[PDB]
Design a protein around this ligand. Structure first.
Ligand SMILES: Nc1nc2c(ncn2[C@@H]2O[C@H](COP(=O)(O)OP(=O)(O)OP(=O)(O)O)[C@@H](O)[C@H]2O)c(=O)[nH]1
Ligand SMILES: [Mg+2]
Ligand SMILES: [Mg+2]
Lengths: 388, 51, 273, 102, 135, 233, 62
RNA sequence: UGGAAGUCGGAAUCCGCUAAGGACUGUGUAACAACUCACCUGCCGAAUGUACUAGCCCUGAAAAUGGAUGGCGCUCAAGCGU
RNA sequence: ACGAGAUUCCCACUGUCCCUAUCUACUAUCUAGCGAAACCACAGCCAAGGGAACGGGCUUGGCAAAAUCAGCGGGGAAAGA
RNA sequence: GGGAUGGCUUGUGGCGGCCAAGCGUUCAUAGCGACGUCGCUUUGAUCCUUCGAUGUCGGCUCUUCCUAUCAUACCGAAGCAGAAUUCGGUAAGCGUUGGAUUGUACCCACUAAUAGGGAACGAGCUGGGUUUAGACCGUCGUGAGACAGGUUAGUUUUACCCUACUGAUGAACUCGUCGCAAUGGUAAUUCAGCUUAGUACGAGAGGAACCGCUGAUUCAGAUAAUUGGUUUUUGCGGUUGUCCGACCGGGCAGUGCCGCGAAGCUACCAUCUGCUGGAUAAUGGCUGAACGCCUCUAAGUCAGAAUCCAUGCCAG
């Protein structure tokens, strides 16, 4: 018969299958729609998640209960070393979809991006792109000019290839991350000129994004392995000492068809899924060369974004960093893709101006109450090892 | 507020009616935290004589 | 209003009642001598007068040992103006009125000698003494008897004579818009364990019982109200909670149990002629 | 069907003013505007139809307890519903009168 | 109006249905027993719960006897479950306590013993008027 | 507002400027809408719409007929005192369907074991248990006649007077299916019952009141919930 | 309540996009484009002018 | 009838001038007024109106996993009658 | 008075529950060695029809790609059934 | 030894009498009969009329479907002034709760609402119908025993097989990097507050709505800066008994016990986020024939629902 008391489904069918992601680096499924009257710009970037911290923000939100008051908010720090552009990929439109037509690479490629093409870089002869580097020299780059004009003549979507400088991060990985970033705005010839002018040049994060802008974060979430139905889907636990498991679903079926349905909660892989989260506000784009990039106009303490004793399981941030309000999918040390919003925003929160008053730099390795080592030294006073 | 957006859009300026010796200080960012200490705790009119 | 005060009005109970009425020739309506007009089911009397006048309704005033004999005789006169009435103390060992009731049933059986047997069904409120009356007439504890209401839940034939049968019935409560939960609890419809906030009915008990009887019963005197009475009774009897706080709820439940079980003497005076 | 009819009839009765509980000015003003006898007759017929519908429903539920086939159950249900419809059809004029008065 | 305060920020709800809290005013009641909260959603097996400033339906279990026969609207003014405000402060009171009011928010009592919550004082001006300490 | 305030508003301000035009256009499109409803409504709504349209067509045809002739009986001639009036002494229903004993009685199972005893029979049809009826003891009753199936009055129609009155039943004279059914007093179709006709004023030739008369049950009480009978005058 | 996929809400959001958030996102776009423009600026066969050929199937093989 | 003039009601429903006009078909007024219908005349230009009957078509009642003129599909049929 | 007898309630008490979370040991897991049994017409994807309201084989369709591992209890199988 | 009605059903009674379009019927002038109508089934009462378990239902968890729509969206009508509604239509996108009562199905509250069903009733777990063996009472029997019955306590215990489902690998095509998207899934939901505005409307009492802004309910996906929880970090300290002669330093009491406790995992017990185009249904129209008036429809065409299909989103 019918179900006596109605209840909504556990979990969403929009995120099936709950399998592991096919690739560690997040995939930009869709780019913002291209307007040829707009100026040329890049639409995405990558960074690495350092960790989280606490801020105090002077809120300017008219009509809110916390208007003209101080709010405490959680933010995420993403270390963003500059990206090097080493390629240009052309796309054409076919009745089967977008198709890549050709790819033009730069003359000189770093060992960081050359490691990406190899699984055993230490045993290799490192021969990658060696014959390709000679077509810049033979016939004055006639083949390079031919492919570039092929992109200018036949292609409609132009994407640069950009790789991260992972050597500036505290990660033990030396293999860099390479991705396609779509050039939006202008004509196709303008895009190709823009890309060739950007070969072999480092691009920083502040030339792609700006403070107070809402972006999207694409990554792979924290993996949990094989997890049962109670934590995987949120089903109600069976009573105590239920025979054959109580952290289970009592009925995986009581009705026709004589099958198990795809909508029934089953134990399996939980976490390590590919997720795209939208509407994340950028609160601060701090510069690596600044020695006071975690100091506000009211907090005059000259200090950096790195917490006291460093980030837990990441290290110390010494490059340009992005502070994002809230949380992002992924773990520490994980590659993150920051993307422009696909649509014009419809909220006043995306038009608000963020005025930070304090950033927490205390230790996340415990109940740290000091923001700098000098503060701890002044509070504790003189110790035995000082006279020793 | 009705000419500048309406209720919930117009942002009021709370420093417009401040009475200061110099009107150029009307929109300064008053420091609060310095080296892990409160500035308002050290604010004193006789701070020069005490120093 | 709690469903515990809705107890006694169930359609299953009234189906049992109408089954007993349909199977019975003589209907013994049992009244409590402490509350005769309160325990009278004029609902069933109207039904019998309208639909089945051939059945014979006989009043039995039970629990006459809890009332003074003059008041019992006055109530006997008042009820015998209406219907044939027998006074009875329903006990197996020491009954009263058993011979008179058996004589009346013998008169009815000789009157219905054409039938093979007659059936006498007992009706009334809960805890008026129906099963006790059946046991007293039988001489053997053939029906279950308890001081709690609703001990009898189904109808039971008991063979008194070869030509006279006795039918037990669950206690019925006719619905009335003037009856209060306090009135039903004082008539003994409900159990005091299930009711919530028992100490509100203590003033009604203190009104219905003379003060000297309560003082002699509990060896306790000098209270100004029911709250202080329950508190000093709790302190005397040791009914204390954690932290030396008196158990006024439990003491009120004890007082109500004594009131409906007849440990505390009380009665309703008969109307003056 | 009985519960729907009883709910509607109780909504009609419990919302119209009770003349005995009004101020004498309001009671006599309604006696001038409306025939007070006709007002009380219309509302009494509404209450009578409500009670008779309840009695019909109880009787036919009791008969459906002892019906032994789907055809007999169907005939009993149709009989009860037809009796309720006849009882409502015998109220053509009081309903119009009460709507105008409302 | 069904007694649902507007403009209430989300905080931890520490008082489910069945809880007994103190009665902070001088209306004559000593404690309140919660039977429902106002503005509760529909969810299977979930007990309705309320926090500081929430209006609940309560019954008097200890107090003056004529308060024990009715169901009163109440506003929770203190809770012992720690909750966070928008300024990042996690806080909790010494006990769970509330005050009996009408459906419109006006208090039946005349004074409040002990402090009241900021949220309760914000959403009920009569409690802010009859309060002595606001925390 | 007070009294006829919408009418006063129309008197002082009128109606909407397109109200008459919209009403006229709606009345013009009523024919198209009626045909679309007739050809596009589905199910019970369509059946009710069709029945109501048939009713209005019949009424309109009769109205047209009455406006057309606005400007315009037995065989043998008999006097006025013989009008409206009408051997073999047969009942109105001389033959009915016989009722089998499974249709009449159902088996009531009793006992506590899995194997029950089935000697009790419950009468499934309406019965008249008689006057001063008290049920037998449960150990000794075989035929169970439930209280909800007992009738004491019947809607009896006088054939010549053409009036129906509710009369008490005195006895069941003949149930044509089985003498046992007559002994049990079962009220089915074609059953002869005895009714008290004291409320009809039937009188003997000298002044004695005829207070008992036979009647025949002409309906199916087990399917109708009522007993309908015709006097045997 | 009005849904997210409601015509009136879509029209209100379209008006908001056209009138309010549009100029702000635009001005941010010229600022960012100028900033990264600063970084960007700071025979036919033998010259590649004529795009020649690079150095299952759609048809039946025949 | 407080008011009721064809048009809130009850009962009758005639005559004249007629080409024709009901003691009136609706709108409307507190009641009137006013408009309109039935009916007549002028313009026009040749076939229409009412009710039935016989074919095909729509509806004429339907639940609950996704599905069945056997499937694709078929519209001067690859449907229906000869 | 006594009772591992049956029932209702009160205080205390608590993860019984809101509403689940975390930890430990032994398994389950992998490896070396050792190593059965139940059961078994043949085999195992469905939808509609298959008069004997049965279908896994028939008809008509959907369709359909080696070989595998951990769980699972819808169906088949499985209860000295 | 043998077994374990169904293209049914739904919203409008019966009996008896009139009336009647019609069907029949002209050498008999009978008989059926739609639509209706008439008789039987308290001046707003009474509460002093509850009328028979042989047939059995519930509950937990969880998923999906139907519409015969309770709420949300839109629309038509009503003395519908406003507010609150009532009746009806399209619509299943999205929700439809927490409790009391077993002397044996109705009450209470919250809420936008607490709509109805199917896939069982034509070997998941657990309480009654329900009933092996022990026992007691009632009725019947001379009796063994049976039952109108009532009460108590009481033995079925898989999965490692195939398929289905949930996940995880994988040969062949040299290896690897960056991509495309056929197909499959698909997601948001409702309420409140500020402003409009004490304005429209109203005699008064009262009292909206569009645009704009801010939160919250339920669902969903993440996350651990902070706050709780968890402690084999057996990290540090305290402490009971015993043992190593005492101290120091340790063992054992399966983690002796206790306090704090990073890190990790976690919680509407914590925080963050949840997005836009087209085509339509009901209806409202424009132009205009059928049909010399007329008409939203016939040709053509405009708008319009949370609907439908896609984008965003997940898999590849
Ligand atoms: N003093 C006194 N007490 C009596 C008398 N008769 C009965 N009682 C008490 O009243 C209580 C009720 O006895 P029951 O036989 O159960 O009466 P009941 O009306 O059938 O009660 P229910 O089982 O609930 O229907 C018994 O516990 C007796 O103690 C009497 O004659 N005198
Ligand atoms: Mg008793
Ligand atoms: Mg008894």
């Amino acid at each position: 018969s019918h179900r006596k008391y109605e209840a909504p489904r556990h979990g969403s069918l929009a995120f099936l299958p709950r399998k592991r992601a096919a690739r560690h680096r997040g995939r930009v499924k869709s780019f913002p729609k291209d307007d040829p009257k707009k100026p040329v710009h890049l639409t995405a970037a990558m960074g690495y998640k350092a960790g989280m911290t606490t801020i105090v923000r002077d809120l300017d939100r008219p009509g809110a209960k916390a208007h003209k008051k101080e709010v405490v908010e959680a933010v995420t720090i993403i270390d963003c070393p500059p990206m090097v552009v080493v390629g240009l990929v052309g796309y054409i439109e076919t009745p089967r979809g977008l198709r890549s037509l050709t790819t033009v690479w730069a003359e000189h490629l770093s060992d960081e991006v050359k490691r990406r093409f190899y699984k055993n870089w230490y045993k290799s002869k490192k021969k990658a792109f060696t014959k390709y580097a000679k077509k810049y020299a033979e016939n004055n780059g006639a083949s390079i000019t031919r492919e570039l004009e092929r992109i200018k003549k036949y292609c409609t979507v132009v994407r640069v290839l950009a790789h991260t400088q992972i050597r500036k991060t505290p990660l033990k990985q030396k293999k860099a991350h390479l991705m396609e970033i779509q050039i939006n705005g202008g004509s196709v010839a303008d895009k190709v000129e823009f890309g060739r002018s950007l070969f072999e040049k480092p691009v920083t994060i502040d030339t792609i994004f700006e403070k107070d802008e809402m972006i999207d974060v694409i990554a792979v979430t924290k993996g949990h392995g094989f997890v049962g139905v109670t934590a995987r889907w949120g089903t109600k636990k069976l009573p105590r000492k239920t025979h054959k498991g109580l952290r289970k679903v009592a009925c995986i079926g009581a009705w026709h068809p004589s099958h198990v349905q795809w909508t029934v909660a089953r134990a399996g892989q939980m976490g390590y899924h590919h997720r795209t989260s939208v509407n994340h506000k950028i609160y601060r784009i701090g510069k690596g060369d600044d020695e006071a990039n975690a100091s506000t106009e009211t907090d005059l303490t000259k200090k950096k974004i790195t917490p006291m004793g460093g980030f837990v399981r990441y290290g110390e941030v010494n490059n340009d960093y992005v502070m994002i309000k809230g949380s992002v999918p992924g773990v520490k040390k994980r590659i993150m893709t920051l993307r422009k919003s696909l649509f014009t925003h419809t909220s006043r929160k995306a038009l608000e101006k963020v005025e930070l008053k304090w950033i927490d730099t205390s230790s996340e390795f415990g109940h740290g109450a000091f923001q700098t080592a000098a503060e701890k030294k002044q509070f504790m006073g003189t110790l035995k090892k000082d006279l020793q | 507020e009705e000419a500048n957006g309406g209720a919930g859009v117009f942002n009021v300026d709370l420093r417009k009616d401040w009475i200061l010796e110099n009107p150029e200080w009307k929109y300064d960012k008053i420091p609060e935290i310095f080296d892990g200490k409160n500035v308002y705790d050290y604010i004193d009119p006789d701070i020069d004589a005490k120093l | 209003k709690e469903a515990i005060f809705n107890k006694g009005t169930s359609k299953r109970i009234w189906n049992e009642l109408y089954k007993v009425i349909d199977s019975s020739d003589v209907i013994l309506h049992v009244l409590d001598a402490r509350d005769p007009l309160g325990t009278r089911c004029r609902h069933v009397e109207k039904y019998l007068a309208a639909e089945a006048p051939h059945k014979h309704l006989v009043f039995v005033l039970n629990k006459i040992d809890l009332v003074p004999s003059s008041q019992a005789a006055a109530w006997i006169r008042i009820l015998q103006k209406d219907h044939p009435t027998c006074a009875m103390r329903a006990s197996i060992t020491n009954p009263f009125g058993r011979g008179s009731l058996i004589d009346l049933l013998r008169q009815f059986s000789v009157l219905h000698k054409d039938r093979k047997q007659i059936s006498v069904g007992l009706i009334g409120y809960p805890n008026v003494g129906k099963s006790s009356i059946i046991n007293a007439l039988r001489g053997k504890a053939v029906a279950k008897v308890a001081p709690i209401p609703g001990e009898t839940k189904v109808w039971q034939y008991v063979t008194l004579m070869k030509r006279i049968y006795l039918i037990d019935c669950p206690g019925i409560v006719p619905p009335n818009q003037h009856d209060t939960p306090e009135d039903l609890l004082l008539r003994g419809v409900v159990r005091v364990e299930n009711v919530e906030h028992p100490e509100q009915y203590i003033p009604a008990v203190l009104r219905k019982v003379k003060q000297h009887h309560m003082e002699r019963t509990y060896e306790l005197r000098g209270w100004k109200d029911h709250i202080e009475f329950l508190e000093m009774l709790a302190r005397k009897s040791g009914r204390l909670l954690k932290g030396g706080e008196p158990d006024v709820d439990g003491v009120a439940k004890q007082v109500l149990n004594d009131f409906m079980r007849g440990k505390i003497p009380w009665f309703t005076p008969a109307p003056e002629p | 069907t009985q519960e729907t009819c009883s709910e509607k009839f109780g909504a009609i009765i419990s919302s119209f003013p009770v003349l005995s509980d009004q101020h004498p000015f309001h009671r006599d003003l309604m006696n001038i505007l409306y025939d007070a006898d006709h007002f009380k007759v219309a509302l009494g017929q509404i209450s009578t139809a409500k009670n008779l519908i309840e009695t019909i429903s109880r009787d036919y539920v009791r008969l459906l307890k002892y019906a032994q086939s789907l055809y007999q159950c169907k005939q009993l249900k149709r009989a009860a519903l037809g009796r309720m419809a006849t009882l409502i059809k015998r109220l053509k004029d009081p309903l119009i009168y009460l709507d105008q008065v409302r | 109006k069904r007694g649902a305060p507007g403009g209430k920020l989300k905080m931890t709800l520490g008082l489910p249905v069945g809880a007994i809290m103190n009665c902070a005013d001088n209306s004559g009641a000593r404690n309140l027993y919660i039977i429902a909260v106002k503005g509760a959603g529909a969810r299977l097996n979930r007990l309705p719960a309320g926090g500081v400033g929430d209006m609940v339906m309560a019954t008097v279990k200890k107090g003056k006897p004529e308060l024990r026969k009715k169901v009163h609207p109440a506003v929770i003014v203190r809770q012992a479950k720690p909750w966070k405000r928008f300024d990042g402060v996690f806080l909790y009171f010494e006990d769970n306590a509330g005050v009996i009011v009408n459906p419109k928010g006006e208090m039946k009592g005349s004074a409040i013993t002990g402090p009241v919550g900021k949220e309760a004082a914000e959403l009920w001006p009569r409690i802010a008027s009859n309060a002595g300490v606001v925390m | 507002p007070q009294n006829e305030y919408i009418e006063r508003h129309r008197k002082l301000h009128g109606r909407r400027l397109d109200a008459e035009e919209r009403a006229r256009k709606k009345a013009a499109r009523e024919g198209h809408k009626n045909s679309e409803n007739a050809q596009n409504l589905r199910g019970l709504r369509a059946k009710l719409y069709a029945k109501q349209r048939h009713a209005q067509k019949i009424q309109m045809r009769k109205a047209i007929k009455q406006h057309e002739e606005r400007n315009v009986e037995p065989s043998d001639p008999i006097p006025s005192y013989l009008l409206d009036r009408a051997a073999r002494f047969s009942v109105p229903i001389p033959k009915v369907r016989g009722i089998s004993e499974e249709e009449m009685f159902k088996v009531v199972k009793t006992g506590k074991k899995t194997h029950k005893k089935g000697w009790k029979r419950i009468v499934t049809k309406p019965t008249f248990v008689g006057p001063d009826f008290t049920r037998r003891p449960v150990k000794y009753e075989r035929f169970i006649r439930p209280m909800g199936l007992r009738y004491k009055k019947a809607n009896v129609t006088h054939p010549t007077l053409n009036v129906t009155v509710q009369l008490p039943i005195l006895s069941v004279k003949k149930n044509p299916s089985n003498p046992l059914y007559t002994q049990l007093g079962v009220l089915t179709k074609g059953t002869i019952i005895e009714v008290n006709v004291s409320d009809l004023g039937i009188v003997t030739a000298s002044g004695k009141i005829a207070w008992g008369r036979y009647a025949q049950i002409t309906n199916n009480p087990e399917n109708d919930g009522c007993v309908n009978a015709v006097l045997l005058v | 309540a009005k849904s997210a996929r409601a015509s009136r809400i879509k029209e209100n959001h379209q008006r908001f996009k056209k009138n309010i958030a549009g100029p702000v996102e635009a001005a941010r776009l010229e600022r960012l484009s100028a900033k990264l423009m600063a970084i960007a600026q700071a025979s036919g066969v033998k010259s590649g002018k004529s795009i020649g050929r690079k150095d299952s199937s759609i048809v039946f093989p025949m």
